Enzyme design. Structure first.
Site, PDB file in Angstrom:
ATOM      1  N   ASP A  61      25.150 -19.210 131.432  1.00 58.60           N
ATOM      2  CA  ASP A  61      24.894 -20.341 132.311  1.00 58.60           C
ATOM      3  C   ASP A  61      24.216 -19.863 133.587  1.00 58.60           C
ATOM      4  OD1 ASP A  61      25.593 -23.343 132.732  1.00 58.60           O
ATOM      5  OD2 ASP A  61      26.284 -22.395 134.586  1.00 58.60           O
ATOM      6  N   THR A  94      20.427 -25.751 134.661  1.00 59.47           N
ATOM      7  CA  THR A  94      20.623 -24.906 135.833  1.00 59.47           C
ATOM      8  C   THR A  94      19.674 -23.715 135.870  1.00 59.47           C
ATOM      9  OG1 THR A  94      22.366 -23.706 134.676  1.00 59.47           O
ATOM     10  CG2 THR A  94      23.014 -25.587 136.014  1.00 59.47           C
ATOM     11  N   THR A  95      19.053 -23.363 134.747  1.00 59.55           N
ATOM     12  CA  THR A  95      18.053 -22.302 134.737  1.00 59.55           C
ATOM     13  C   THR A  95      16.646 -22.852 134.914  1.00 59.55           C
ATOM     14  OG1 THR A  95      19.501 -21.256 133.105  1.00 59.55           O
ATOM     15  CG2 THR A  95      17.396 -20.196 133.560  1.00 59.55           C
ATOM     16  N   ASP A 391      29.076 -27.880 129.380  1.00 60.59           N
ATOM     17  CA  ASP A 391      27.684 -28.322 129.409  1.00 60.59           C
ATOM     18  C   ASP A 391      27.460 -29.463 128.423  1.00 60.59           C
ATOM     19  OD1 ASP A 391      27.079 -26.530 131.369  1.00 60.59           O
ATOM     20  OD2 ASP A 391      25.743 -25.283 130.159  1.00 60.59           O
TER      21      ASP A 391
HETATM   22  N1  LIG Z   1      16.247 -26.031 119.079  1.00 57.50           N
HETATM   23  C1  LIG Z   1      15.457 -25.774 120.146  1.00 57.50           C
HETATM   24  N2  LIG Z   1      14.157 -25.455 119.989  1.00 57.50           N
HETATM   25  C2  LIG Z   1      13.360 -25.196 121.039  1.00 57.50           C
HETATM   26  N3  LIG Z   1      13.777 -25.232 122.314  1.00 57.50           N
HETATM   27  C3  LIG Z   1      15.058 -25.538 122.618  1.00 57.50           C
HETATM   28  C4  LIG Z   1      15.991 -25.832 121.525  1.00 57.50           C
HETATM   29  N4  LIG Z   1      17.177 -26.100 122.096  1.00 57.50           N
HETATM   30  C5  LIG Z   1      17.018 -25.985 123.439  1.00 57.50           C
HETATM   31  N5  LIG Z   1      15.755 -25.648 123.747  1.00 57.50           N
HETATM   32  C6  LIG Z   1      15.212 -25.441 125.110  1.00 57.50           C
HETATM   33  O1  LIG Z   1      16.108 -24.685 125.923  1.00 57.50           O
HETATM   34  C7  LIG Z   1      15.991 -25.116 127.278  1.00 57.50           C
HETATM   35  C8  LIG Z   1      17.344 -25.102 127.971  1.00 57.50           C
HETATM   36  O2  LIG Z   1      17.987 -23.852 127.763  1.00 57.50           O
HETATM   37  P1  LIG Z   1      19.561 -23.694 128.044  1.00 57.50           P
HETATM   38  O3  LIG Z   1      19.833 -22.286 128.514  1.00 57.50           O
HETATM   39  O4  LIG Z   1      20.286 -24.239 126.843  1.00 57.50           O
HETATM   40  O5  LIG Z   1      19.885 -24.705 129.258  1.00 57.50           O
HETATM   41  P2  LIG Z   1      19.326 -24.518 130.756  1.00 57.50           P
HETATM   42  O6  LIG Z   1      18.308 -25.619 130.906  1.00 57.50           O
HETATM   43  O7  LIG Z   1      20.555 -24.663 131.615  1.00 57.50           O
HETATM   44  O8  LIG Z   1      18.719 -23.141 130.765  1.00 57.50           O
HETATM   45  C9  LIG Z   1      15.422 -26.522 127.248  1.00 57.50           C
HETATM   46  O9  LIG Z   1      14.248 -26.580 128.057  1.00 57.50           O
HETATM   47  C10 LIG Z   1      15.047 -26.777 125.807  1.00 57.50           C
HETATM   48  O10 LIG Z   1      13.694 -27.222 125.739  1.00 57.50           O
END
Ligand SMILES: Nc1ncnc2c1ncn2[C@@H]1O[C@H](COP(=O)(O)OP(=O)(O)O)[C@@H](O)[C@H]1O
Ligand SMILES: Nc1ncnc2c1ncn2[C@@H]1O[C@H](COP(=O)(O)OP(=O)(O)O)[C@@H](O)[C@H]1O
Ligand SMILES: Nc1ncnc2c1ncn2[C@@H]1O[C@H](COP(=O)(O)OP(=O)(O)O)[C@@H](O)[C@H]1O
Ligand SMILES: [Mg+2]
Ligand SMILES: [Mg+2]
Ligand SMILES: [Mg+2]
Lengths: 528, 526, 538
Positions: A61, A94-95, A391
């Site tokens: 996170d 948050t990232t 989350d």
């Molecule tokens: N199955 C997937 N395929 C492609 N991109 C994904 C998938 N699942 C999540 N993402 C991407 O991951 C990003 C978010 O990453 P994550 O670390 O889960 O949350 P955070 O936004 O807090 O970093 C989002 O911008 C999303 O587009």
């Protein structure tokens, strides 16, 4: 400079102003963003941070990682603050917020080095952010049917998307179904305190369960507890806030007697007070007795002799969840234990989970609360599972509030970048360069996804740009096939509020950082 | 571990802070000696790190005896030294002018004007100042001794020697006149080498005089010599009059009994031959920069010749100039033309508790010594500095016969001329031009402040007077704080000194205005 | 001959760490230099194009703002003259609420020109007299420069337009939205009675949703949760108690003396019955919400839950008084049921969640009430603090407008006109005071010059154009910041105006500080002490 026999400010004051100060601020923001770059996407990685006490924390996170870092740079703390803001308001992204803010600052750094006035950059950011938020609200896909099956499927897809970056991404469908089930049983306020999270060491991830009721650990049973039966088939639960012990009647109470008969009467009176409390509890028909305050050994043995169950020192939130599930009321007095204030569950049972004893209240039909029992091989394993589930819970709650979704994988941001570039190509030209820089900066997230996956970011970005320009709104990065795909058809769904808040917070942070021109650091007082 | 792209002990400053610091340092340097300008100047006591004391009001000496750390102050000190070396006068004036110009430049630097514009305006103003100063100049008949004495008096009116004005002026004029030399079509003065200033503490300052010859702190080698020779024939030498080892290694080998005595006798015979070669010219005085052997002294006394040994090379050159002799390094090559005839008296007399050699009646001498008598060594040092200023002014006038009005009249006239020229500029650089033009008013302002009168009223009256047509010679009376016609008071000063002062001040302002970055702490890397 | 001894007299008598500075060069010029340094440090934040400054105090608390008073508060100023000018600026902030940067800039310009005048030959007394005469002339001229009046304060659009200028200097990008918010909040306050109270405007900062999501609420918001189980009331009849929600106890000493078994068995039952009777008596009056300033007993909470009464606990008594003003209730000293006059009414009280924090909202439906609250959203705590400072400036501007309704043109127009008129006046005054009067007039140029410098244009061209237009006869023409080249425009139509009292008090305080700094001739600083702060400031 000159010695200035009497100096203006206190000795040791450090001041930095001008273009170098703002460039250094941008560099510090870049340094902060570099610390969470590899945590984004399904191919993201976890970070381990050890504090001074030696306790290590392992998290994917972004907000947690930024909080653990002891950032002291005044401009860098803005990124941590906006990450905290994104976590508080939304719970996901948050990232992305930090990456977007740092990318904005990086893109405008060359213009800053040329002497461009910061107010122009701030106005350009404000215009671009307003346009991007309006575009997000315009192109977000929503269904005006209120179909229960469709709504549940949408919630599950959003939870899976929010979960497919954590260590539990292998069981993301299982955990997303659990999270949606848990959220759908909250009544109207979706209070987080109504979803209990219990972490028990040992067992696999798939061994974790969601209790349609309430469960909590055994709380320091006294002697005679083992004679109490540990299973009931239609118990009535007496939730109490009462100390069932032999104790002084009051702190300031004092007894003055001058006869042995009165002495015996006083002793028997204390015993009769305790036994009257216990008898009033017993005649209520309740079989399970839970108290917020301690229950003594005398009361424990009394209840054991009546085939009853007692559990003192129950935590207040666990009692609140038990009240919300079984449907009774916490009583500070046992004088009126009517059927109205008694809870009711189908099955109560005490079982063993990984070397710990837990009390289970299952079968509640009108339950408005839940309890997650998470199993894992390590403390930090369970903690990070809890963070991932949190989350997902925030995402599902926000989706309940408004069922507006956009495709993930960078598709929404590529569409926004194309729209902003098209808009910028139709303005005088001083703002054109800055809005184009903003649009180019929005491409960080797909590039970061490709970099984390070990892809070729340039080729994927070129394909995405061409596809968006020639037609196609929800085309993003496909991690599995190392190509691009229609992420909306791949069910990579994010609530629109996540990206709206991300853009708003990142723009505000960038504008705040750019607006500063001088930093003054007063000397520390009482350094010791 | 610490990377350090640059060295740790390196510190860098940049921006407006550097310019403000440089201008403030120059202002502080100017403020140090602001009060040492004018006929009513007050002296200062300087404590040397070696334990000595310097009591003076000369600007260059005061600034030289101060150690500073800010490099702008070092630039100001170098400026003062340059002004002293080039012309010998106007050090306080140039320091004050540089400070004022830098202040009025800081005025514009506080706004959004680039230093290059200020520098260009300063250079245009410097050209105009030179033109105006040349315009308002007047010629001088150098053959008139009264005018030269008046010029020297105006030069030394502001120094501690002003109480004895006629004496000091006559001393300086006579020294500069008699040291003036011309040979092979080249004219020279050379106050540095000849016209030596010798100070003997004691006596009275009224007894100070310039001799028609030279004086050295030397006594005759032998008591039997003559301490008073009427019309001496002086011979000067460089080589010692004693037996010396050869350049090459020349070990002898003695096997006969009579060889040792022969060696000693041949040493004596060599000394005798050298002395006889000297005597062949029939001189009366022999001066040597190196030792004279006792046997040589005997052989010289045999011919009634007074010998002096261990004289400094500069002193011997001055003696040669005074008595018209030529230094000869080999007595066997002594010619008649090398014998110095022209000295009219030689006398070894005792002053206090020391013997002094006087060659003080030369006819047409090209070198001289200035005998200073005073209360102590500090008073005599200040008197010597004042005499140096007077001789430098006299030399400048002799080289350049132009004069400009003093008492701040030239400052105000040039400022008015530049202000009049500035109304036709119609540009953006006219403001620095006018500001640096009016910065010249700091000299009359300082004069009025030192006199103790009202600065604002007198300065306004002087400006109003200079707004008239024929008023370029109206300055400030430094003793009474009144406006006078400078051709009535008669305090004129050489045009060369004023030109050098203006040029140096403007160049210092240009140099210090050009710097915006300071980096320090790096090694010498020599 | 190697050391300079201390001069006999005061120099030898002085203490070890003490410092003594006397005379023009050693005292007055040093003070002027220090004041000029302080003014230069604060200068860059002046006007709409001012830049924020990250100031970190001795407690590692980060302040980012362009409010001059805040910057001077968080700066460890050591020079006594700069301390005096800071005191003048803070007095301006306390008296009016805006114009602190103007005070600092004007004082710095006045002191710099005073140094210049002293250098050219004027005396300190002459400069002070000329400055006082010119200040009197400026105060006489100022009422003639009034261009328009407020002419209404119960309107919304007009007051928003009035307050836009005050909060355009800070938060230049988005001032219309903040102006609308502050205008609504102030119009809710300020009843038919002409008295307006600044304290009645409350600001609650909740993090998360960007400042564009901020709103104004007619009531109060408290960032905490309810003690009971009831979390929403639709026809609140709040009863406010300044006493703990518990059985009242003796102030002397309590001791339950038990002599028989019957008393021991009956004591707790009787106490429970008594407290139940008290709570039922409170509930019988219709009070469905109870607010207490003390602790809540467990039996009290149980019996309040039994009778469906919402419990809210306010630890701070200032919040209790503000709530009493908002609802219209009286703080009962005892636990007696409230009579109909003391029972406050609020149209809605509920527990809600905004962003992350839990809040309790006492919401009125009317656009009236004694207290109004502005809830500020945002992505950063520092940004919300800066928005709160802007809100304070807007509220103070509204209060000043309630006091005096006259306005003067902004953007340096008033300063340029004042400088022109004072220069014209000084051109006629004979004597040495004319130099001081002209310098006082010229000191007004520092305002348009600073505005132009912050805007990024050439100050000299702007000032020359301003003089040209003002000589033509346009007194409402000032700097135009919406241009890349030096330009001027009429600022009555632009709506950029300043309060008359603000300018009057700023000029008065700046001149007073300048003359007070000039009056000092000797400084005798004692040895600095490392004491744990003076006891007066705690
Ligand atoms: N199955 C997937 N395929 C492609 N991109 C994904 C998938 N699942 C999540 N993402 C991407 O991951 C990003 C978010 O990453 P994550 O670390 O889960 O949350 P955070 O936004 O807090 O970093 C989002 O911008 C999303 O587009
Ligand atoms: N009697 C006098 N009355 C007025 N001014 C004088 C008088 N004598 C000299 N001055 C002025 O004083 C200046 C010389 O000051 P001085 O102490 O010599 O400075 P510096 O050593 O730098 O030349 C000259 O510019 C001259 O005009
Ligand atoms: N839109 C505008 N255009 C030009 N000048 C403005 C504008 N808005 C405000 N100003 C000027 O900015 C000044 C306010 O500066 P500010 O930063 O508020 O300092 P202070 O808080 O001390 O008043 C006012 O004098 C006003 O004339
Ligand atoms: Mg996520
Ligand atoms: Mg001189
Ligand atoms: Mg203001």
């Amino acid at each position: 400079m000159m010695p200035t026999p009497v100096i203006l400010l206190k000795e040791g004051t450090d001041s930095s102003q001008g273009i170098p100060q703002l460039v250094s601020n941008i560099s510090a923001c870049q340094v902060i963003a570099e610390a969470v770059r590899t945590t984004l996407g399904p191919r993201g990685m976890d970070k381990l941070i050890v504090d001074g006490r030696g306790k290590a924390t392992i998290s994917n996170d972004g907000a947690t990682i930024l909080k653990l870092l002891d950032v002291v740079h005044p401009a860098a703390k803005t990124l941590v603050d906006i990450a905290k803001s994104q976590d508080a308001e939304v719970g996901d992204g948050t990232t992305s917020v930090t990456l977007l803010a740092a990318e904005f600052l990086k893109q405008v750094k060359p213009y800053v080095e040329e002497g461009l006035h910061p107010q122009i950059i701030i106005r350009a950011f404000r215009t671009a952010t307003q346009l991007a938020v309006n575009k997000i609200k315009e192109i977000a896909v929503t269904v005006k049917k209120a179909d229960k099956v469709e709504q549940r499927k949408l919630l599950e897809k959003c939870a899976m998307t929010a979960l497919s970056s954590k260590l539990i991404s292998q069981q993301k469908a299982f955990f997303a179904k659990m999270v949606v089930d848990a959220v759908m049983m909250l009544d109207d306020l979706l209070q987080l305190k109504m979803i209990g999270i219990k972490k028990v060491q040992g067992g696999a991830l798939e061994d974790s369960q969601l209790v349609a009721g309430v469960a909590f650990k055994k709380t320091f049973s006294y002697a005679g507890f083992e004679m109490q039966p540990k299973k009931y088939h239609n118990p009535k639960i007496a939730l109490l806030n009462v100390e069932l012990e032999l104790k002084a009647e009051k702190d300031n109470a004092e007894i003055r007697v001058h006869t042995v008969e009165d002495y015996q009467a006083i002793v028997d009176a204390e015993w009769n007070i305790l036994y009257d409390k216990l008898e009033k509890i017993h005649h209520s028909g309740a079989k399970v007795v839970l108290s917020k305050l301690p229950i003594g050994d005398v009361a424990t043995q009394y209840f054991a002799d009546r085939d009853m169950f007692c559990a003192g020192r129950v935590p207040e939130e666990d009692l609140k969840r038990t009240m919300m599930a079984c449907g009774g009321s916490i009583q500070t007095s046992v004088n009126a234990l009517s059927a109205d204030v008694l809870g009711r569950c189908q099955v109560f049972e005490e079982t063993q989970i990984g070397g710990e004893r837990y009390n289970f209240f299952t079968g509640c039909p009108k339950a408005k609360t839940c309890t997650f029992i998470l199993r894992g091989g390590a403390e930090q394993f369970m903690e990070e599972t809890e963070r991932s589930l949190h989350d997902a819970i925030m995402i599902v709650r926000r989706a309940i509030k408004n069922d507006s979704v956009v495709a993930g994988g960078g598709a929404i941001e590529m569409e926004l970048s194309k729209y902003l570039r098209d808009y910028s190509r139709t303005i005088p030209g001083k703002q054109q360069l800055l809005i184009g820089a903003y649009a180019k900066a929005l491409e960080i997230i797909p590039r970061q996804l490709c970099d984390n996956a070990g892809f070729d970011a340039t080729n994927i970005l070129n394909k995405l740009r061409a596809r968006h320009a020639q037609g196609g709104t929800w085309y993003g990065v496909d991690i599995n096939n190392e190509d691009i795909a229609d992420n909306f058809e791949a069910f990579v769904w994010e609530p629109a509020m996540v990206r709206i808040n991300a853009l708003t917070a990142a723009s505000e942070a960038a504008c705040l950082i750019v607006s500063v021109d001088e930093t003054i650091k007063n000397p520390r007082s009482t350094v010791d | 571990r610490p990377v350090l792209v640059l060295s740790q002990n390196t510190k860098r400053e940049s921006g407006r802070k550097v310019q403000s610091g440089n201008i403030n340092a120059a202002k502080t340097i100017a403020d140090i000696i602001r009060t040492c300008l004018g006929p009513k100047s007050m002296m200062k006591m300087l404590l040397d790190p070696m334990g000595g004391i310097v009591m003076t009001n000369d600007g260059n000496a005061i600034l030289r005896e101060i150690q500073v750390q800010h490099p702008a102050a070092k630039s100001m000190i170098e400026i003062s030294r340059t002004q002293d070396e080039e012309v010998g006068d106007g050090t306080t004036s140039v320091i004050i002018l540089a400070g004022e110009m830098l202040s009025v430049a800081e005025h514009f630097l506080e706004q959004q004007m680039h230093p290059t514009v200020v520098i260009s305006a300063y250079r245009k103003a410097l050209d105009d100042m030179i033109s105006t100063l040349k315009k308002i100049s007047i010629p001088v008949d150098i053959s008139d001794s009264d005018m030269m004495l008046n010029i020297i008096n105006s030069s030394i009116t502001t120094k501690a020697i002003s109480r004895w004005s006629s004496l000091a002026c006559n001393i300086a004029l006579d020294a500069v006149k008699m040291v003036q030399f011309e040979e092979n079509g080249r004219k020279e003065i050379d106050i540095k080498k000849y016209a030596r200033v010798e100070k003997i503490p004691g006596g009275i300052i009224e007894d100070s005089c310039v001799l028609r010859g030279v004086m050295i702190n030397k006594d005759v080698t032998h008591p039997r010599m003559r301490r008073y020779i009427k019309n001496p024939r002086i011979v000067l030498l460089d080589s010692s009059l004693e037996y010396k080892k050869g350049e090459s290694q020349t070990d002898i080998e003695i096997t006969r009994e009579e060889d040792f005595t022969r060696i000693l006798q041949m040493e004596e015979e060599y000394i005798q031959q050298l002395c006889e070669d000297i005597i062949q010219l029939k001189p009366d005085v022999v001066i040597t920069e190196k030792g004279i052997s006792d046997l040589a002294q005997h052989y010289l006394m045999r011919a009634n010749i007074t010998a002096i040994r261990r004289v400094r090379k500069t002193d011997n050159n001055r003696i040669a100039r005074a008595c018209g002799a030529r230094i000869v390094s080999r007595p066997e090559e002594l010619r008649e033309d090398d014998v110095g005839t022209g000295a009219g008296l030689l006398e070894i007399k005792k002053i206090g508790d020391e013997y002094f050699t006087f060659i003080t009646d030369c006819k047409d001498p090209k070198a001289c010594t200035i005998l200073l008598r005073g209360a102590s060594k500090e008073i005599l040092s200040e008197v010597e500095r004042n005499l140096q200023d007077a001789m430098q002014v006299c030399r400048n006038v002799l080289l350049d016969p132009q004069l400009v009005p003093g008492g701040g009249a030239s400052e105000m006239a040039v400022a008015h001329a530049l202000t009049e020229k500035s109304k036709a500029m119609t540009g953006v650089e006219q403001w620095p031009y006018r500001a640096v033009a009016q910065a010249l008013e700091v000299i009359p302002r300082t004069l009025i402040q030192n006199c103790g009168a009202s600065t604002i009223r007198l300065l306004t009256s002087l400006r109003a007077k200079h707004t008239q047509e024929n008023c370029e010679t109206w300055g400030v009376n430094g003793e009474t704080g009144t406006l006078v016609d400078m051709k009535e008071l008669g305090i004129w000063e050489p045009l060369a000194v004023k030109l050098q002062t203006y040029k140096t001040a403007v160049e210092t302002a240009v140099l210090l205005l050009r710097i915006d970055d300071i980096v320090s702490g790096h090694k010498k890397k020599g | 001959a190697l050391h300079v001894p201390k001069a006999p007299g005061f120099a030898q008598m002085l203490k070890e760490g003490a410092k003594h500075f006397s005379g023009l060069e050693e005292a007055v010029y040093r003070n002027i230099q220090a004041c000029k340094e302080l003014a230069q440090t604060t200068r860059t934040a002046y006007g709409p194009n001012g830049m924020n400054k990250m100031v970190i105090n001795h407690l590692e608390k980060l302040f980012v703002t362009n409010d001059a008073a805040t910057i001077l508060r968080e700066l460890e100023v050591q020079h006594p003259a700069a301390k005096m000018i800071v005191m003048a600026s803070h007095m301006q902030e306390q008296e009016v609420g805006d114009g602190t940067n103007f005070v600092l800039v004007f004082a710095g310009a006045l002191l710099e020109l005073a140094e210049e005048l002293l250098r050219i030959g004027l005396s300190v007394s002459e400069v002070i007299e000329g400055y006082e005469i010119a200040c009197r002339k400026a105060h006489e001229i100022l009422p003639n420069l009034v261009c328009c009046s407020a002419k209404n304060l119960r309107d919304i659009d007009e007051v928003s337009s009035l307050l836009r200028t005050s909060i355009m200097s800070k938060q230049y990008g988005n001032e219309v939205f903040l102006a609308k918010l502050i205008a609504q909040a102030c119009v809710s306050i300020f009843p038919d009675s002409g008295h307006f109270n600044v304290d009645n405007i409350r600001v609650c900062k909740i993090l998360g949703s960007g400042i564009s999501s901020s709103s104004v609420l007619h009531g109060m918001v408290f960032k905490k949760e309810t003690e009971g189980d009831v979390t929403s009331v639709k026809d609140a009849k709040i009863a406010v108690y300044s006493c703990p929600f518990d059985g009242m106890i003796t102030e002397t000493k309590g001791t339950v003396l038990i002599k028989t078994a019957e008393e021991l068995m009956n004591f707790s039952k009787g106490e429970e019955n008594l407290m139940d009777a008290q709570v039922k008596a409170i509930a019988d009056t219709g009070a469905n919400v109870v607010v207490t300033g003390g602790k809540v007993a467990d039996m009290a909470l149980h019996y309040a839950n039994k009778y469906n009464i919402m419990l809210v606990r306010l630890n701070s008594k200032w919040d209790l008084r503000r709530l009493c003003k908002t609802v219209g209730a009286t703080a009962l000293p005892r636990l007696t049921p409230p009579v109909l006059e003391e029972m406050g009414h609020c149209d809605s009280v509920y527990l809600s969640e905004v962003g992350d924090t839990q809040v309790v909202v006492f919401k009125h439906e009317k656009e009236d009430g004694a207290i109004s609250t502005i809830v500020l959203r945002g992505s950063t705590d520092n940004l919300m603090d800066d928005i709160e400072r802007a809100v304070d400036d807007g509220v103070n501007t509204f209060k000043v407008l309630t006091r005096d309704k006259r306005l003067v043109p902004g953007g340096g127009a008033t300063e340029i006109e004042l400088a022109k008129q004072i220069t014209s006046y000084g051109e006629t005054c004979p004597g040495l005071e004319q130099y001081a009067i002209k310098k006082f007039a010229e000191a007004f140029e520092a305002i348009p010059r600073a505005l132009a410098e912050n805007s990024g244009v050439k100050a000299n061209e702007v000032i020359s154009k301003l003089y040209a237009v003002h000589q033509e006869g346009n007194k409402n023409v000032g700097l135009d910041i919406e241009a890349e080249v030096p330009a001027v425009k009429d600022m009555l139509e632009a709506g950029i105006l300043d309060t008359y009292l603000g300018k009057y008090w700023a000029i008065k305080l700046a001149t007073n500080a300048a003359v007070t700094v000039l009056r000092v001739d000797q400084i005798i600083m004692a040895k600095p002490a490392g004491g744990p702060k003076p006891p007066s400031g705690k």
